[PDB]
Design a protein around this ligand. Structure first.
Ligand code: ADP
Ligand code: MG
Ligand code: MG
Length: 203
């Protein structure tokens, strides 16, 4: 009763709902993400792999006490690791681990912490890959954190999404197999849909 509302910051419950929301959002794009998948092999599963990663994070959030930020961060990291499938799922789970690490010790997610979490998430994903390649989900995730600017949550999500979409468009310029197939990177495209889902929850 005595805890007011933060206009541009998410409490632990809102952070959990945001990832549940983005998981429900993601399902419409799975078939497209599968068909984009050419790197490292064209086996049509990037969307399915990333969705299984997000759904496992959602199941853990449903089991956790989402009134404590540290509990939301634990479920996000632990759930995405177990559900991770394929290269995109493992990388995504490690991005989410760095995201969750930024939330630890904090009581609310504002624009400043969202920028920090997106940047730490990208660093965590880059450190976890043994041999990173550019033009990929790592390039897109790094750009989203670097371009995340502003103090209000809506502006940070908007600028991060715009930076991610710009990096996504340039992935064929960096990775020849994408150019030859005439596609953008499926993993990077999946991360854009994740950021889009987060913007949809905040809007
Ligand atoms: N070494 C790497 N560096 C950066 N990103 C990578 C690397 N390997 C794979 N990826 C990402 O994984 C995506 C493919 O994921 P997915 O289809 O699940 O992989 P697979 O089916 O080969 O296990 C790629 O589009 C790319 O974004
Ligand atoms: Mg694949
Ligand atoms: Mg595969």
């Amino acid at each position: 009763y005595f805890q007011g509302h933060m206009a541009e910051a998410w409490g632990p419950e809102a952070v959990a709902e945001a990832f549940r929301y983005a998981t429900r959002w993601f399902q419409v794009y799975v078939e497209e993400l599968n068909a984009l998948n050419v790197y490292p092999v064209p086996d049509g599963d990037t969307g399915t792999n990333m969705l299984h990663t997000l759904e496992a994070a959602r199941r853990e959030l449903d089991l956790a006490d989402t009134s404590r930020m540290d509990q939301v961060a634990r479920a996000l990291a632990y759930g995405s690791l177990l559900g991770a499938r394929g290269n995109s799922g493992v990388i995504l789970s490690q991005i989410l681990r760095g995201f969750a690490e930024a939330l630890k010790g904090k009581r609310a997610l504002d624009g400043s912490l969202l920028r920090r979490a997106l940047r730490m998430g990208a660093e965590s994903g880059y450190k976890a890959v043994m041999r990173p390649v550019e033009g990929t989900i790592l390039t897109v995730a790094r750009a989203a954190g670097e371009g995340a600017r502003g103090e209000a949550l809506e502006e940070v999500l908007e600028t991060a999404l715009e930076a991610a979409r710009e990096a996504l468009e340039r992935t064929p310029e960096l990775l020849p197999v994408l150019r030859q197939a005439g596609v953008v990177d499926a993993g990077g495209a999946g991360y854009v849909r994740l950021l889009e889902g987060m913007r949809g929850y905040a809007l």
